[PDB]
Amino acid sequence: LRPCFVSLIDESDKPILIYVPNEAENEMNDVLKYNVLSNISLDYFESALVEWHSLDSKPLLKSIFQLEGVSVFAMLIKQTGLKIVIGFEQKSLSGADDEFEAINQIFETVRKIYIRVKCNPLLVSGDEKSIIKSLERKFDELFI
Amino acid sequence: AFQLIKNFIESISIEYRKSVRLLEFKHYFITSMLSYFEFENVSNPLLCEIKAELLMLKRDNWVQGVMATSETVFQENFLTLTKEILSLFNKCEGKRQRIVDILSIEIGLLYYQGKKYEEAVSLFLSCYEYYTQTNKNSIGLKILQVFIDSLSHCPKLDVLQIDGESVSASAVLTNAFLNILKLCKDNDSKEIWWKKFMDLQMKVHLARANVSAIEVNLKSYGFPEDISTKTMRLSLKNMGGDVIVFGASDFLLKKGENKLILECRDIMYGEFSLLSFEIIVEGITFVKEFPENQDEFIVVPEIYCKESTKVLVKQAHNLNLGEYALELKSVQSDALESLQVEVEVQKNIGNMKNLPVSFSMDEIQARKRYNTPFENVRLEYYLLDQITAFDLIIKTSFTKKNDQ
Amino acid sequence: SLPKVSQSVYQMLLNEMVPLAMGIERQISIKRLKIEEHHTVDIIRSHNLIHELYKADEEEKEKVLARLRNIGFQIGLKLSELLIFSNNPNLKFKEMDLLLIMKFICRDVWKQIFGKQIDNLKTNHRGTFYLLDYDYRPIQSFSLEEDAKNEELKMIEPFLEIPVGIIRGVLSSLGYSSEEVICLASFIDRGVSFHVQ
Amino acid sequence: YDYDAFKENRIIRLLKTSIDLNKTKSKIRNLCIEKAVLDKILICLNKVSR
Amino acid sequence: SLKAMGEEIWKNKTEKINTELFTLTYGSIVAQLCQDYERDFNKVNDHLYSMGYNIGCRLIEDFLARTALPRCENLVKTSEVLSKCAFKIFLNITPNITNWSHNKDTFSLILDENPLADFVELPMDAMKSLWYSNILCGVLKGSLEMVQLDCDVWFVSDILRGDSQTEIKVKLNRILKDEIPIGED
């Protein structure tokens, strides 16, 4: 339910944010874990075994893999190319569908809070210091 | 349906509450091995091997998790066989080219767990770099942090033949990239222990890109027959250096190369230099654009080609505050054309030369547009010759040597 | 449904970024004055500020008309994400065709700025799509003097450089920079025209 | 303009401009008092007589 | 009296969405003044004031056209109609009236929500140099003089720079007159 990393990738494969929400932990110990998973999760968007259809207004969630006891869940919204990938630890999952839809509204909060600061009409347009250091002070408000 | 089998692989893992029994579910992964034979219908294809390799990768991760309560070195000698087999399976005719680099780095992390062996990650620069300033800013820090101790530890300085750079140049580029991508406060030990070696090994042929230390300008004033020359303020990124830094203002037909110095001891942020310049060219013309090189030579030309065509127009005009120069006037003449040149003289004496410049050859002191160079001259007279004479140009280059 | 505010303050806001454009270009810092709390502000109003563009030097006018499409660019590429959250189904980012996003914009943007469709769309198949609307909304209420109708089209020609920027912004939301022109193109019964490139 | 340098005036300048000269004076390091005296002199010699 | 007639005008008025438009429009034309001046912030207030003046002077005739109101004279009546049937008709919000002066003159205009600074985060270089919604002082100064008053308006604080509310301290300084239709014979 509470994630262990979130990540947002732009029109290219350049990462916009690879964010850990339990930030300065005792088991920080590397940031390589939750980073190489995102680097392989961009490669799992042209894997032919999973496929995202292109007809509906609400784009869909997927359950791509599990590794290190961390499950990933990814969306490709099809219009601004936004590849958004999250992870949870393995035994926080219950296997039910109410938490699955809670994961879907976790996505519908974080897509909303990214496109809000995509439409903050005072920034200069780019991936500057400002956008990341606004995204973290909104994600610390969302995730304590 | 393998995805449905992955749902089956998500099924019993949902119903797992005993990690000694779930290793028998890893035996169900062996049953997935009994599905891996039962998914095969041929020898090889692209999409078939791409579907095949992921279940073997999940079984390899389960076999890696099987040794969580710890076969002495058999795991660390044998898991690379299945890892290289999985990378060879996922290297089959599709663009999955971040699995290859991550799998090669996963093999390299176990090569470093052995003795500091022959490198593949440090082998090719770009390969080892893996989009250092394009991929991210964390994975490549460790992928260079292992390679730095690999090239340092091996103590044999014959590099690989992607480009034979068999020196400390590759490790200096690694040190510069790791110091650029670091945190600021915590990288003192990363800075000093790899900045010390290039002092003793000063190969010192480097052309950096200057993302660590930044620069900004100010107004420009005069000095004692010298230019104050745009009293710049620089940032800081590391401990110290010793650079003979010089900027390069360049007009539409020349390059001033002013704002020079000799010594620098920049350690603090907002460095705020003065950069006093001699050799003030172009009569301090106003159209001197900033090529803005700022080649801070900290035992390497760490330049920054900060170029545009913004027309901000650094003017930096002249001043006359009792310093030695030369002028031109033609008074007390006879009934034919001439010229004269008086200099506000001083102690030290050296040379000057004047040249005509037009579309035709308008003035002619000789038969051609001559020089009439002289050493230690106060005032004299130079003649001219015939053209459609209304107003010609001139250029009087005076190597005065009052300064250096 | 949604929270709403009134159209008559928005349309009157939308009419007058062109006096804002000449007040940002001409005033780099008969003109009048006013005061506030130990200050002053030098004022010039809209009738004596569009009429400085009928007497405009040509680099000054073309310097102004980049700013109107820059405003339109910023509001378009900020508007497209919220219209994606409205619905925006069945199209992609690289978007190999063009009619499926020209079906998008007339049904989905131009309803949210002006309340109706772009009612005509002509298909040159090499990529020049003509978008024709007959009664454009903010130019419902502008007229010149007693039959001086020739000298008002060239007077009112900055006001169509907002939907240059709108269709630049909603296509830079889908990838790239293009080339745009405008027309007037009067009706057949009781006009405007835009290209694509 | 020297056509009225010997007809009821002297030092009356012709129709040049001063905004570009003021921009060139601002683009150098000229002080506010020196620019005040120079703008006052050019303002007086915008139209004068002697 | 008034609040019934305000909703009565909110049943025959043309409407559109206040999210996803108009915060976009006002933020785009403050980003232009941010970049046009070239990142200086104490000047954009004195251009947004001079633009809000010109947009208020023409708004006042529309507002008198929608609801038939007499010429307001005291600051009971202007403060009642601004809180009940000007901001309710045009922007769907209503303010509240605190901080009342002596001798019935200078009051405050605390805005509860604000559909001009709605969902805006303001960057750190303008914590002490910018007023964001300073088209509102433009519409009040250029709208209240057109019913032949004379006022002065200024923001005091804002939610973006400060935890305290968005309030405008409008001051009556004098009331203007009507002029007699010739100089003389």
Q: Which fold has domain A5-142?
A: Beta-Lactamase (3.30.450)
Task: Give CA separation, B165 vs B145, B149, B162, B171, C183, in Å.
Answer: 19, 18, 9, 10, 62
Q: Provide the 10 A C-beta neighbour count for residue B111.
A: 18
- Report the first-to-last Cα separation within chain B, whole angstroms: 83
What is the C-alpha to C-alpha distance for residues C95 and C127, in angstroms, rounded to an integer?
Answer: 13
Asked if D27 contacts B313 with a C-beta cutoff of 8 angstroms, the reply is yes
Identity of the residue in C78, C82, C93 whose CB atom sits nearest the CB atom of A78: C93
Identity of the residue in E34, E35, E121 whose CB atom sits nearest the CB atom of A120: E121
- Report the first-to-last Cα separation within chain E, whole angstroms: 46
Residue B18, SS3?
A: coil
Dihedrals φ, ψ of C112, to 5°?
A: -90, -5
Q: Do C37 and E152 touch (CB under 8 A)?
A: yes
Question: If residue B398 lies in a helix (H) or strand (E), which one and from where to where?
Answer: strand B395-398
Asked if B61 contacts B78 with a C-beta cutoff of 8 angstroms, the reply is no
Chain A's closest residue to E34, CA to CA, is: A122
CB contacts, 8 Å: C41 with chain E: 46, 49-50
Quick one: which of B218, B210, B299 has its CA closest to B259?
A: B218
Do A and E count as touching (3 or more CB pairs closer than 8 A)? yes
Chain E's closest residue to A123, CA to CA, is: E123
Which tokens sit at C176? Answer: 């790239």
Range A8-23 burial, b when 16+ CB lie within 10 A, else e: bbeeeeebbbbbbeee
What is the C-alpha to C-alpha distance for residues E87 and E104, in angstroms, rounded to an integer?
Answer: 22
**E133 Cβ partners below 8 Å, 6+ apart?**
E114, E116, E117, E155, E158, E166
**DSSP label at A91?**
G
Experimental method: cryo-EM
- Report the first-to-last Cα separation within chain C, whole angstroms: 37
Ordered by start, the domain boundaries in chain A are 5-142
**In Å, what resolution does this model reach?**
4.3
What is the C-alpha to C-alpha distance for residues B186 and A17, in angstroms, rounded to an integer?
Answer: 23
Identity of the residue in B10, B14, B134 whose CB atom sits nearest the CB atom of A14: B134
**B256 Cβ partners below 8 Å, 6+ apart?**
B248, B249, B250, B277, B280, B281, B282, B288
Q: What is the dihedral of CA E112, E113, E116, E122, to 10 degrees?
A: 90
Asked if A33 contacts B154 with a C-beta cutoff of 8 angstroms, the reply is no
Dihedrals φ, ψ of A87, to 5°?
A: -135, 150
Q: Residues, chain A, total? A: 144
Q: Provide the 10 A C-beta neighbour count for residue A92.
A: 14
Do B and C count as touching (3 or more CB pairs closer than 8 A)? no
Quick one: which of E92, E118, E106 has its CA closest to E172?
A: E106
Task: Give CA separation, B69 vs B19, B64, B65, B72, D18, in Å.
Answer: 11, 11, 9, 13, 86
State the smallest CA–CA distance between residue A114 and chain B in angstroms: 19
Q: Give Cα C33 distance to the centre of its chain.
A: 30
CB contacts, 8 Å: A115 with chain C: 81-82, 84-85
What is the C-alpha to C-alpha distance for residues B148 and B171, in angstroms, rounded to an integer?
Answer: 7
- DSSP notation for C129-197: EEEEESS-GGGSS---STT-THHHHHHHGGGGSHHHHHHHHHHHTTT------EE----S---EEE---
Q: Do C39 and E46 touch (CB under 8 A)?
A: yes
Give just the sign of the alpha carbon dihedral B330, B331, B332, B337: positive
Q: What is the dihedral of CA B220, B223, B226, B228, to 10 degrees?
A: -30
SS3 content of chain B, % helix, strand, coil (to 5): 30, 10, 60
Neighbours of chain E (3+ CB pairs under 8 A): A, C
Q: Where are the beta strands (DSSP E) in B306-350?
A: 338-340
Ordered by start, the domain boundaries in chain E are 1-185
- Burial (Cβ within 10 Å: 0-12, 13-18, ≥19) of residue B332: exposed
Quick one: which of B356, B353, B344, B343 has its CA closest to B387?
A: B356
Residue B24, SS3?
A: helix
Which tokens sit at A143? Answer: 């995730």
- With an 8 Å Cβ cutoff, the interface of chain E facing chain A consists of 23-24, 26-28, 30-31, 34-35, 119-123, 126
What is the C-alpha to C-alpha distance for residues C25 and E37, in angstroms, rounded to an integer?
Answer: 10
Quick one: which of A67, A42, A47, A43 has its CA closest to B51?
A: A47
**DSSP label at B250?**
B
CB contacts, 8 Å: E11 with chain C: none
For the domain bounded by E1-185, which CATH number is listed?
3.30.1380.20
